[PDB]
Amino acid sequence: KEALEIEKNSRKPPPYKHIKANKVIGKVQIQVADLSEIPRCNCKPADENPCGLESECLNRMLQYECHPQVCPAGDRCQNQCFTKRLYPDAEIIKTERRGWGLRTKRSIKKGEFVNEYVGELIDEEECRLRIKRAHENSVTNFYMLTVTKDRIIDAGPKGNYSRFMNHSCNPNCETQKWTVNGDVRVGLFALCDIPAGMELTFNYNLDCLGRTECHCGADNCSGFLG
Amino acid sequence: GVLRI
Ligand SMILES: C[S@@+](CC[C@H](N)C(=O)[O-])C[C@H]1O[C@@H](n2cnc3c(N)ncnc32)[C@H](O)[C@@H]1O
Ligand SMILES: [Zn+2]
Ligand SMILES: [Zn+2]
Ligand SMILES: [Zn+2]
């Protein structure tokens, strides 16, 4: 008769549409630069690792992605991460107290691009409506991230593997706001070297708009999510 | 709540 035996471990996460890039919703509009507006860095195509993590790259320093038609380095440019969508291979995992999570299948170096946070791009009003409807339906998983005050990415209905990354108070990745072809997008970047097999986490820096309990396990855990 | 960068 066991309450322990009532095995309701979902064998798979609830459905979502796995998408490559953000999808604008309602009033939210498409932001695209003219090729004439893309910043050009001063890296040289002869450089070792042109526009790389260790480089002086003026674009990378200001979190601007290079456009290959613009960059002096051509297709050798190592600052095309968002557009190339080269992500370390990742795997969805089941946790006991934090739902589904995500782990890396390979080793990742400090500062390396891990993923793009993609989803439906919605305005504040739509964000609030969605949160209200979620509370009315006793939903406890939220996938909303503010890019700017009226541009919020909702990775709930549609997203990529980044939607599975859990919150940690002592994370191994962080979000950064980058400009890519005149649009503001959100990347996840490693804060440290990460061995293959490790769960990938970031600090949500949550604006709660009461608190949810945090199970991240960190020594500095506040006890509360975000 | 909503995540922030
Ligand atoms: C973006 S989702 C992450 C994936 C989610 N775990 C799932 O199963 O789909 C965020 C939600 O996961 C849960 N979560 C994430 N980090 C957590 C933590 N450290 N402790 C408790 N719950 C967490 C919360 O319900 C949060 O709203
Ligand atoms: Zn450069
Ligand atoms: Zn470049
Ligand atoms: Zn915590």
Residue numbers in the entry:
A (entry chain A): 1058 to 1266, 1269 to 1285
B (entry chain D): 1 to 5
Task: Quote the study on this structure.
Protein methyltransferases are enzymes that add covalent methyl groups to arginine or lysine side chains of proteins employing S-adenosyl-L-methionine (SAM) as a cofactor. The NSD family members are large, multi-domain enzymes that, in addition to the catalytic SET (Su(var), E(z) and Trithorax) domain, include known epigenetic reader domains such as PHD and PWWP domains, and these reader domains likely contribute to chromatin binding. Given the evidence linking NSD family members and oncology, there is great interest in developing potent and selective inhibitors for one or more members of the NSD family.
Two peptides were synthesized based on the H4K44 substrate sequence used in the assay, PTD1 (15 residues) and PTD2 (5 residues), where K44 has been replaced with Nle. In order to understand the binding mode of the peptide to the protein and to further validate these inhibitors, the structure of PTD2 was solved with a SET domain construct of WHSC1L1 comprising amino acids 1054–1285. WHSC1 and WHSC1L1 are highly homologous proteins with 45% identity (53% similarity) overall and are 78% identical (84% similar) in the sequence corresponding to the construct utilized for structure determination. Significant reorganization of the autoinhibitory loop is required for peptide binding, as the peptide overlaps with the loop in both the WHSC1 and NSD1 structures, both of which are in autoinhibitory conformations. In the complexed structure, the autoinhibitory loop moves towards the C-terminus of the construct to open the binding site for the peptide. The interactions of the peptide with the protein are dominated by hydrogen bonds; with the exception of the N-terminal acetyl group and NH of the glycine residue, all backbone amide and carbonyl moieties are involved in hydrogen bonds. As previously noted, the norleucine residue points towards SAM and the terminal methyl of the unnatural amino acid is 4.1 Å from the SAM methyl group. The alkyl chain also makes hydrophobic interactions with Tyr 1262 and Phe 1259.
